[model samples]
Target chain A: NLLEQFILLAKGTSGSALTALISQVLEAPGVYVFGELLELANVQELAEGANAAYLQLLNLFAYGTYPDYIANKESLPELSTAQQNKLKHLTIVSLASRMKCIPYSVLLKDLEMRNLRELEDLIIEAVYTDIIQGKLDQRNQLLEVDFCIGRDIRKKDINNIVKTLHEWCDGCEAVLLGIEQQVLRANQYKENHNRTQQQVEAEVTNIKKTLKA
Target chain B: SVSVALHPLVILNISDHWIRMRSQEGRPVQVIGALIGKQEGRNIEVMNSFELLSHTVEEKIIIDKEYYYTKEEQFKQVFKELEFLGWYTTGGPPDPSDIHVHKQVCEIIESPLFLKLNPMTKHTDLPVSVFESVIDIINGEATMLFAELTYTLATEEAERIGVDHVARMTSTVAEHLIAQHSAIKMLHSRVKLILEYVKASEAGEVPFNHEILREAYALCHCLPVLSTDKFKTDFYDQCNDVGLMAYLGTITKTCNTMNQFVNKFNVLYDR
Candidate 1:
């Protein structure tokens, strides 16, 4: 095996050689090998030049999440222009994977874009990348995302969804109460109207009898 | 009671394996994954699975022993809670060879499940058929028979994301494109259906079922509440902002085009 080969490659290598080997094996299938290499202290040390961003890319592929790379973009080592584009695309895909529906504005703001065209272009790029599949509903100004691979939902996201559900339950209870009160009010008004009509009819009959007498 | 709730990722990974192997190797691939849940008390729940690489097997009924050990070791290192549940193979209605393989797997892990996936089946309600090995003594000779076990897909809020992902993949692109919109449409239709039922009950045409009412209440409570006015305002703002950007983009394009024309004329005159 490939695992044994990877182990052998990892054992007697450091710096550029090791990094180059890693860069070559950078793929979804080599996640296990990459993960093993990541545990090495020497490998971590040698993660500079090309290895830094490539390491980050490996983390993204393996773990399905990344740190706030957008905020720390400058601090990170320089990735190739192609790698940079892929990073941005994967970042967008990850965000979309977590949400049911995302507004164009939210996506644009997160991706630091000036317009919907740019945002849609990025989404389309992600779709064609086969990392994600979604639709751009320009009429609703929303991205109706469907599926993505290996969703790494954070603990905070779960809490937020639960909180939102609780708020929804409260809102539903309030709505039910409002409808019940309106029905009662409508019935009371109808009862009052019927009683008033009965009294007016009785008075009219009595007045007609006195006029005839 | 042993129960397994297969995650969508597991299903996707298995299908992917089937496709890759069938295309490249011209053979069916067996899927192995780590199963997570309680290992005791007569109850087990398989919560998730990850793809495991196994050696190519040309043997009639042998699972790659070395592959199994390596994967199990890796899994043990990473997933402390998960255990070797069993193995799944692609194809429907297990054959004799499948039973032989199942017997071998059971030797490794007690009460190993055989999850049979018919990737060939275009549409299936569950898509996974689980089986347990049962032994019978006939004529003083032991025989193994595969018994089907009922399995359910986990639908709790925590597991909804995975289920949703799986459902989207299994569905057509047209359906997935409008998944959220279709969900809202479904909710609307359900409301209309409930209204009609209530109206029929008022007219003494139908009786109100408590179970149906309870389910309706549950669904209603599950819906997210949104502030309409806030949503409208934010939506319009985004639309206007995008419009402004598009206009600015066109202006820049026109300027570039005009500059290009001037450059062309100047180049000709200079020549």
Candidate 2:
């Protein structure tokens, strides 16, 4: 009945009305209701409020990167210890997602963990929690990252990726130009050497004919 | 043939609502949204969409009598180029009650698209299954037949910001339930595979064309390098400034109160 009320409220309202309605019964709302509320475009105002920190964590998990949480940790309202742990695990998985295969040392540095064993435990916990799926290559000291889903890549990230791709394309063009010039120079050198060899051979044949006469 | 270009945000909106409804009501939810785009000849390009309030259903027919009119008008006032492309519903199989709604929609706009939101399959491939209704006369009776149309996922520069948010949330929720890592890892591993190709070419094991070599070189350098240390410094500096200002304000207020106290004490002594 509470769930139905929320859907009804969400259906008819937008902006502050919806936010106000949710805030009234947010603590008692269903587990999935928080995720739905976070998706609303008008809900960003509540993102920094301590009362709605749980929802904020959900919102962050949905569309924010680990780096985003770290950068904005000061203003992230307040959340329960359990919620904080979940957020941390989610962040670790999301950061791991950016790389294909991460070494233990690299993962430790990125996650600021103490040792390889701790990193492995975290990775194992992540796998068990279903935050990530991959094998840990103990011999190579690598976490062969299989997948990390739910990292909300921002528009700036997309723009950066496209910009990087363009720079790569330009670099490829330059390298091609260099290779083209080198091949041209090599062909020019071969042509000059062939011409000189032919002239020397012709001069030798002409001298032998004169001696015979 | 009317063509509609569905954006990812629409799928995200529908699915999010669907999940909530399924869990809350223990039944599938029907969603309706306004499609924004241009209509040329027989084609409709549905570039964007917004969820509309039309949840009431009596005898499988949507009973909201006056909502669509005001909503359509409000949307049009904001976006002059937008027209009523159609609406979205859940489940794959066609329902007879939908004919009543379809008839109501056609009266408003010709050849409205029926976007069926399928939640069973992962939307990483195709999100919404699109269909168009074809009016047929069977035994002198008018009937509607749904023909599946090939629809493509598209994104606008402005829409990317919202879509990116939705994508992240969807992924997060999904990972929370059951983590799937193969796809994202596969995307990154392709760089390694490309590097291997470059290595083979470098070793002269394979004939390297100038174009291929250049492309490989570009791929190698495509990853962006961020200065985290620099970003950390800038962020902490801002935080520190805010803290300092607050502390300074507190001390100033205290000093003002102390000066007032001293003045009051002097007046009492003189009296």
Candidate 3:
């Protein structure tokens, strides 16, 4: 139904840009976050909510899509404290830790701190916000539907901060969260290994024996 | 306009094969205009070399041994900053055989609490030359780092590394700032400050106030604003009304408060 309205706008809009705008606007977070922009005048409150999501979505997408460009230009909007905290929770390593990967395992994945942090932040923030807001609810009765997308962001694809978050938010939160939790456990093992000067497997073996001892 | 044409510059011997250009007014090589092309297969080098030679001793001088050695040490220091900023650097970790030094290194990288308080920028008062040299090295290093990292995710046919791609994108936005600095003949101090911060970042030493970033942004004519019509459509726009500074905030978080390098730049530019 939303797609039908979007198609109508594409047909009626004055120019090529307007058509593109209609298409882009539909694919953007708005249709999902606030429903339809054309219907906004009749429902002022919904319009406001859509606008809020749209702007935040714009910023998020900008970062996810073009982080380096944003960082270099000094034009991109900085996140609020709430947003910043949300981002920290959303990082790949953080998500991986949450998903039960070894902590700092994502560190082993690559070396770009800002990208890793920004992407993780985007994923967490988008997923958390969407989940809490119930924007992804489907099946008419399902409260908060999980989108279940895949992950292949190398760094460049994660240009827009929020969009990058949204794409990853759909399907991977639990997995990332489980990984992150697992990483914390792994790190605990690593810390013990530091004290004992034992290999990783040896440390685990010792832990099991100590319980028996 | 005379300053534009005669912007006291230098082209230092990089290797037998390459050369570097900079402001002889005192700083590392950053002037893009002075470099006509690469060292090989270019007639520009012939006249360019002699033209460079004709300048006063202050401008067309050979780098001394002391400078070369210092630059090398500074290169290592800058690499350390790149690592702190969350980049995996080109150089691998120092040999594990020296466990004591390696342990110290690992602790610094691993400890979040320690990082929060004692963020890099540990040593102060490094020379501008060292700073300039390090950025050139980092820029080159960043390019390669991105290339390698991207190759891992995308197939070989991929266009570029994510890091490199981002750098290229951001650099386009930033390149204009550098270009404007050159046009106005005020690039040295700014580059100097960037080098200092980059080094500080690697050292994982935090300066109390981030004045350096502020001053740096000021030179580029971009910083935080109190209010703007730009935010009317977005809810986040209202957030700026409370304490929204802009680029200045980033700059402040990025470097020291004194930001003497930037202050010196201000003095020169204002004059």
Candidate 4:
């Protein structure tokens, strides 16, 4: 709801206001998924400006992951503790997409979090913030990925999308082959059963004749 | 110490009540509510909460027992198991007034928990806090000292979706697409390293392992279908008719889209 206001505010915003707007976008609670914020022309104006790193940080939150930020942290501005947290929260969402149950061991390394409770805190906050819906499976020390919403898409990811599609197509072929064999076997079984019924009928008539004689 | 297992509903309800009151009432009235949940052994799970009306007093606030009885009975009838675990109030921190409130609350429910919510929190941590009152010797006189306690957040799937919708909508398309791209890049990078290994061995860095190159080709053709429930059904499909029909539907849409695109192209084209 407030994002629309920021989008409108971006029109007249320049310099410090623009910087503050960017800060607001990051600081605002319950405001994840920033593609629309990133799209604003005025918001994009910061790409070459002095505070381009915040723009970079926004892009990172939108499409990039924590490890991505860490790898390129040299070029990026030092992340505020809040920005640090928001990225890691989103990081869990990304890690969870592929796996149904993620081990604490994996998250511990990826999130670079210190303790189990701290990790659980991040996961719970992610849940409360509505960024992701999941369970901490505390006993098993695994993060259960019940559901999550995506953040943003990069146009460069077209190839990956295509690859996923191609795999789906091939899996279809495997399924079709399985069905074909099953159906063919079923027909053969029916035909053989019918043939046995014919023999039984002939044998019954002969037995009746023999009994009468 | 009783282990408190809080739910998303209570937090949400408290936040709503606090936000509701703070907006209309400029003077902080201190929005207070009852935390209803079950207590088993030393474990307390707070499942629900509702706002309470109370008359304020300097030392001890006058809680409307009549309203409390009515609300408590209604929840008891429905939830059957939920009982008063404690009471929650929204005001940035604990003050002397809380000791009075906690003292009064303790009268109705023995050893009642005192939950404090700092709605206007600046830190990354949740604004919620839970405390248990411990009697300690202060100047050789016993005094109630509020010891902060940790609680776990447990949620049902339905409430998860409910709170998620109420907060910010999610994006699975983003999750899958991004994870896929990164994994693909990682895959290629690893394959390159393996190829470097194969080349090194080719130059007599080690014995020529023919199987390694063969394994590398096997790796190239591999894809992750990840046989799951729908996956199992699709892989060993009972009837290709249902599945193939969906694929055919996809083709029809693509054909229609292309035809529409061509129609627009024809209409717009000029010398």
Per-residue lDDT of candidate 1, residues B1-271 (tens digit): 4656655555666777778777887776555443444456655566555554544467565667677788778777887888877777777788887788778777788888777788767784657888888899999999998888877665567567656765778523234335445555554455656655644543457654433433333333334433346677998999999999999999999999999999989998995
Ten contiguous residues with the weakest lDDT in model 3 chain B? B126-135
- Compared with the true structure, model 2 gives a TM-score of 0.35
Query: Residue B268 lDDT in model 4?
Result: 87
Q: Give residue A99's lDDT in candidate 2 (0 to 100).
A: 62
Query: Model 1 chain A, poorest ten-residue lDDT window?
Result: A26-35
* Winner by TM-score: 4
Ranking by TM-score: 4, 1, 2, 3
Candidate with top lDDT is: 4
DockQ of model 2 vs. true complex: 0.01
> What local lDDT score does residue B140 receive in model 3, on the 0 to 100 scale?
53
* C-alpha lDDT of residue A20 in model 3: 44
lDDT of 3 by residue, A1-213 (tens): 554565465454433444245336524442322223333333223224323333333334322322332353344344344433333323332233113222333422321345445534444455564422213212331122123222222223223322323333332444444545665666677678676765766878989999997
Task: State model 3's lDDT.
Answer: 0.32
**Relative to the unseen true structure, what is the C-alpha lDDT of residue B162 in candidate 3, on a scale of 0 to 100?**
40
User: Residues A27-90, candidate 2, lDDT per residue (tens digit)?
Assistant: 3422222334455555555555543554564466555645566667765644444444455566
DockQ of each: 0.01, 0.01, 0.01, 0.01
lDDT of 4 by residue, B222-244 (tens): 33424336667776675787779
- Which residue segments of model 3 deviate by more than 4 Å? A1-176, A193-213, B1-20, B23-271
